[PDB]
Design a protein around this ligand. Structure first.
Ligand SMILES: [Mg+2]
Ligand SMILES: [Mg+2]
Ligand SMILES: [Mg+2]
Lengths: 48, 69, 156, 96, 96, 48, 97
RNA sequence: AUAAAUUUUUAAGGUAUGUAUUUAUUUUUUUUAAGAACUAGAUACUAACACAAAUAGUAAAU
RNA sequence: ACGAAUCUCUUUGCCUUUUGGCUUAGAUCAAGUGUAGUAUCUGUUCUUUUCA
């Protein structure tokens, strides 16, 4: 991410970018198992 | 009434019973017989085992790297 | 349909959690009306659960904060865990920390519902037994006083 | 082990007060017929024995009963659906 | 005898060894009355014998003729895959 | 001494229990510190 | 173990994109403006895209119905929603699971 | 100048399940409920009962 | 004086009606109506001792 949020600071307003990078970190719940997504990219996101 | 068992059935309980005499199939004679033993390339920006476990194995991580995808 | 939380339903939840445990939520939203599993558990983990830390800053927590939040541009749930503090609060108290820079009826009936629900532990089978057995007892007592009144006629 | 000893002592001294108190308030035969043995005993002291046992059963039984009363009336903290929640849950209080 | 001794009295064997219920069955009376791949296999087998032996019984009575006899029992041994239904019980027999 | 079982999942008699029977130490690696500040430096160089 | 990139690689990459874009002479995107001339169209598109999932369905589950509601209203109150959004992007940083 | 031909069938998995159906005669010291009447409907559960007419406990649906 | 027995209370000990299994958390989770049966939720008005 921290690399992203920069690379997006390039091409888009710092807001929107922030909305994205921050849009990835989430909990992810399968049944019981759940974990923060600290690192990768979630593809199911409409803009992914 | 679903309960973890605390016990098992003594074979003896069976042993006292009288027989039946039903004939199975797998008891029919087989093997009646014993056996005895005796220029351009510079341009680009980049200038010059077995772990007892499963989920940390190299195989398993290949596998999960295929199928679940 | 857009909802918010009364302390009524909130308490009914904390009672429910206090029984069914966290992971059975779709039951916890049975007692509780108006609500869903993800709603229930959302409020629970993000707010209600007591083990959460709601308190002030400290200069450890602050210099810690501007440190982390500068290092990781927007990654709040990460940073949140890093602070062992809830997410939106760390976000909020953060923004505030840079804001120093400047230039009774059917609810009582649902409560009757749940309040009645918790207090029966058995399931259909056991209750059915209770009945069957008592019916047997009445049958016995009847048959007796049959025989008693027959004895008052002398015929045994 | 030690408990069984201690109880042995307690009923020793108690027995002593029985005998002495009975002073204050005041063989072996064999059958050549069968290997059964025959001892001769008073109907006394058997009754003191049995009675003592019965009264022990009583007093213990009653300590446990009054303990039921007190213990079940007092603690009012934890949630209870029924009796066994109070019981078990007080075991969980016994833990720490 | 085997049937009536399992207390199934509402099944009928006609003279051709078909097995028919005479009275719409209470489900319990179905379960109690499923019969085995034995009993059925054997009923079918008897059916085959009855069939052949009948055709002879006819010819002796003088109602047929020796050619129609021969053709008959030929027809039987070929069309067993129809006249009976033994192939329900040993399905193997679908080789023959 | 063995404790008593309180399991988030099953509750076979319906018993009720005080919640807390139902219910990290490390910091980051300076890999981060270096990362974000390096991105930062190259950034401000570039913008200048 | 920390992040993998190392700062070295990071900086090289960033600089790459930079020389590219400058060279490419590129203007970055602006925030969607409140006064927008095309806007309602774009919103028509996105919303049809969500709508289409449910076109076929005959039984709608809970989350679904929740959705269709949110859509239908979004058609109804375009200025409302667009304001709602531009707010959301300007601010909200934390999200549901 | 080609002769190249697989198969084919039976059971199992509104309702199961359970209960009673005796007719024909086996010897003589305790204690307190606040009491009574009126009234309406509102949330519930249910019911092989009612909207060319039909579904059940191996399988379910864009 | 101390010793002992009895009654009562307190504390410790003992645990006294003191969580009994497995599989994809075992799976699924709200779309109706008419009448009818039962459950039970409010208010109103009057009144607080005894003997043959
Ligand atoms: Mg079955
Ligand atoms: Mg099976
Ligand atoms: Mg079944």
């Amino acid at each position: 991410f921290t690399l992203l949020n920069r690379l997006l600071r390039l091409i888009v307003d710092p807001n929107i970018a922030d909305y994205i990078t921050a849009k990835n970190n989430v909990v992810i719940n399968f049944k019981d198992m759940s974990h923060v997504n600290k690192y990768g990219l979630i593809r199911g996101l409409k803009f992914a | 009434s679903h309960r973890p068992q605390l016990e098992a059935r003594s074979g003896a309980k069976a042993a006292a019973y009288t027989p039946t005499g039903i004939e199975h199939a797998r008891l029919l004679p087989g093997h009646t017989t014993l056996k005895y033993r005796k220029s351009w390339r510079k341009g680009t920006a980049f200038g010059r085992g077995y772990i007892n476990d499963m989920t940390k194995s190299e195989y398993h991580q290949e596998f999960l790297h295929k199928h679940v995808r | 349909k857009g909802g918010v939380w009364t302390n009524v339903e909130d308490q009914i939840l904390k009672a429910a959690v206090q029984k069914y445990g966290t992971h059975q939520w779709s039951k916890v939203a049975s007692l509780l009306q108006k609500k869903t599993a993800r709603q229930s558990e959302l409020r629970w983990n993000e707010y209600l659960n007591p083990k959460l830390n709601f308190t002030e800053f400290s200069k450890e927590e602050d210099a810690q904060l501007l440190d982390l939040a500068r290092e990781l541009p927007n990654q709040w749930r990460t940073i949140a865990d890093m602070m062992a503090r809830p997410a939106q609060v760390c976000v909020e108290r953060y923004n505030r920390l840079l804001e120093s820079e400047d230039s009774e009826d059917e609810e009582k009936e649902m409560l009757a519902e749940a309040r009645a629900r918790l207090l029966n532990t058995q399931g259909k089978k056991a209750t059915r037994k209770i009945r069957e057995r008592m019916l047997e007892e009445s049958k016995r007592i009847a048959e007796l006083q049959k025989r008693r009144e027959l004895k008052q006629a002398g015929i045994n | 082990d030690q408990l069984a000893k201690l109880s042995y002592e307690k009923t020793l001294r108690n027995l002593a007060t029985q005998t002495q108190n009975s002073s204050k308030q005041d063989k072996v035969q064999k059958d050549t017929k069968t290997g059964k043995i025959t001892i001769a005993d008073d109907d006394k002291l058997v009754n003191k024995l049995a009675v003592s046992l019965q009264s022990e059963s009583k007093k213990r039984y009653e300590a446990r009963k009054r303990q039921m009363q007190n213990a079940k009336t007092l603690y009012g903290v934890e949630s209870f659906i029924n009796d066994k929640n109070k019981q078990f849950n007080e075991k969980l209080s016994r833990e720490s | 005898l085997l049937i009536h001794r399992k207390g199934l009295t509402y099944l009928h064997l006609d003279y051709n060894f078909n097995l028919k219920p005479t009275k719409t069955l209470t489900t319990k009376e179905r379960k109690k009355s499923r019969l085995g791949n034995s009993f059925h296999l054997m009923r079918e087998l008897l059916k085959m014998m009855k069939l052949i032996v009948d055709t002879h019984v006819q010819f002796r009575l003088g109602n047929v003729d020796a050619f129609q006899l021969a053709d008959g029992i030929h027809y039987i041994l070929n069309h067993i895959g129809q006249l009976t239904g033994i192939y329900r019980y040993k399905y193997k027999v679908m080789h023959q | 001494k063995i404790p008593a079982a309180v399991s988030n999942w099953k509750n076979p008699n319906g018993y009720t229990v005080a919640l807390e029977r139902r219910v990290e130490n490390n910091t980051i690696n300076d890999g981060f510190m270096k990362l974000s500040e390096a991105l930062e430096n190259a950034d401000k160089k570039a913008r200048q | 173990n920390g992040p993998e990139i190392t700062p070295e690689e990071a900086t090289t990459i960033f600089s790459v994109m930079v020389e590219w874009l400058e060279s490419r002479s590129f203007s970055p995107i602006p925030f969607p403006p409140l006064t927008y001339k095309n806007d309602t169209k774009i919103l028509v598109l996105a919303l049809e895209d969500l709508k289409d999932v449910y076109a076929s369905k005959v039984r709608l589950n809970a989350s679904e119905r929740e959705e269709l509601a949110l859509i239908e209203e979004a058609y109804d109150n375009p200025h409302d929603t667009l304001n709602r959004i531009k707010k959301y992007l300007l601010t909200q940083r934390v999200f549901k699971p």
